[PDB]
Amino acid sequence: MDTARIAVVGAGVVGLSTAVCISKLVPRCSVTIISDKFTPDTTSDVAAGMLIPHTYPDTPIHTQKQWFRETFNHLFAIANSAEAGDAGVHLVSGWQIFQSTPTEEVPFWADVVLGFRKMTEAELKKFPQYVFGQAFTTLKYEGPAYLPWLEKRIKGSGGWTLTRRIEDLWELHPSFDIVVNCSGLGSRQLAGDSKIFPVRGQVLQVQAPWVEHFIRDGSGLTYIYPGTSHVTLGGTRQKGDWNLSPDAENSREILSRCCALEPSLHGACNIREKVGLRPYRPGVRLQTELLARDGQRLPVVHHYGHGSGGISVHWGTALEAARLVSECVHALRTP
Numbered sequence: 001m002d003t004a005r006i007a008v009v010g011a012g013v014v015g016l017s018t019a020v021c022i023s024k025l026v027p028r029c030s031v032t033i034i035s036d037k038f039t040p041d042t043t044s045d046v047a048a049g050m051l052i053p054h055t056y057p058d059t060p061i062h063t064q065k066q067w068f069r070e071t072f073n074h075l076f077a078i079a080n081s082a083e084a085g086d087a088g089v090h091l092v093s094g095w096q097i098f099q100s101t102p103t104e105e106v107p108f109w110a111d112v113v114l115g116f117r118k119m120t121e122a123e124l125k126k127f128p129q130y131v132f133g134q135a136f137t138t139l140k141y142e143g144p145a146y147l148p149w150l151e152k153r154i155k156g157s158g159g160w161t162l163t164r165r166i167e168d169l170w171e172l173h174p175s176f177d178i179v180v181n182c183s184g185l186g187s188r189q190l191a192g193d194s195k196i197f198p199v200r201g202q203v204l205q206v207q208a209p210w211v212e213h214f215i216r217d218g219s220g221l222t223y224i225y226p227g228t229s230h231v232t233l234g235g236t237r238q239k240g241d242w243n244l245s246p247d248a249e250n251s252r253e254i255l256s257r258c259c260a261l262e263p264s265l266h267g268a269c270n271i272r273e274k275v276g277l278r279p280y281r282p283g284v285r286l287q288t289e290l291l292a293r294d295g296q297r298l299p300v301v302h303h304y305g306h307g308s309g310g311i312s313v314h315w316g317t318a319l320e321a322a323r324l325v326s327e328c329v330h331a332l333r334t335p
């Protein structure tokens with residue numbers, strides 16, 4: 001037929017990024033986006049948005065580092081472009097502190113992020129309960145702004161957004177050629193894999209524009225991130241908690257920790273708490289599965305289980321997923 005009919009389930013940041021890379025990799029494409037919840041309210045919108053490579057347990061550290069590099073150098077061109085307002089990608093400076101001096105003070109992502117260095121004595125004076133610190137400048141992406149921009153790009157490519165429920169993948173078989181699974185935590189029901197589980201995270205969005213440097217205490221328990229609209233203050237990592245009701249004691253402990261780290265936070269307004277379910281998987285599922293039970297073929301390339309560090313690597317993972325897509329499309333062309 002000389003045309004390929006693609007499909008991407010998932011409206012998260014990676015669900016759209018994958019279709020972007022597919023539209024710019026595969027020669028002949030007709031990729032569509034099909035998800036229950038789109039860019040107004042996805043788990044990628046509630047996300048803080050800082051580009052800090054959280055260490056994946058089950059992925060090669062050089063592969064993960066390269067993913068962060070490929071993502072960073074794309075967002076870095078975005079921040080220097082004219083569309084940085086609409087795409088919502090801005091350079092954010094700040095510091096990563098530590099309770100005790102680590103054995104090695106250089107991570108695997110020092111030479112990619114801008115100007116990795118140590119905190120001076122005068123900089124260590126800003127935090128009395130802390131011995132060692134690091135200083136650097138990264139990029140933060142606003143989800144309620146970045147994801148709509150990706151939508152406006154894929155619309156130019158030729159895709160469209162359908163809002164329907166997909167209980168099982170076989171609904172796409174009698175029409176679509178290949179399916180791209182980017183449903184995130186939802187894929188637990190889609191692909192049946194039980195490895196992915198939800199890590200609950202609650203963040204208080206407070207408004208205080210004087211804060212302009214981010215502050216992360218190394219532990220995931222305390223992060224203070226500046227935002228273009230709401231300063232994002234959070235440190236909750238409950239595991240297996242599907243509960244999306246904002247619990248109050250978390251809003252107490254997060255505020256106490258973050259207020260201790262940055263004191264000027266005392267005079268702040270509009271302390272509105274939201275929650276989210278990180279789709280956690282030891283290794284981000286990125287492989288081509290060919291499921292077909294007493295029927296015709298159905299190639300499905302999986303792409304989920306991003307965890308707490310999926311945004312900082314969403315472009316590299318998109319590249320690898322589009323690689324599998326191109327390989328399988330070639331397998332369909334040639335016999």
Ligand SMILES: Cc1cc2nc3c(=O)[nH]c(=O)nc-3n(C[C@H](O)[C@H](O)[C@H](O)COP(=O)(O)OP(=O)(O)OC[C@H]3O[C@@H](n4cnc5c(N)ncnc54)[C@H](O)[C@@H]3O)c2cc1C
Binds near residue numbers: 034052201202306
């Ligand atoms: C509070 C919080 C803070 C975070 N902070 C950071 C951070 O600073 N840095 C970082 O790198 N990462 C961070 N993350 C992680 C990051 O937000 C996610 O891991 C990642 O964006 C999710 O990738 P995804 O697009 O596959 O999943 P999602 O964003 O959840 O996208 C999945 C989408 O697929 C669709 N879908 C789902 N199920 C179905 C179904 N059954 N049928 C049809 N469509 C379906 C829906 O539209 C859904 O929104 C954070 C996460 C949370 C919760």
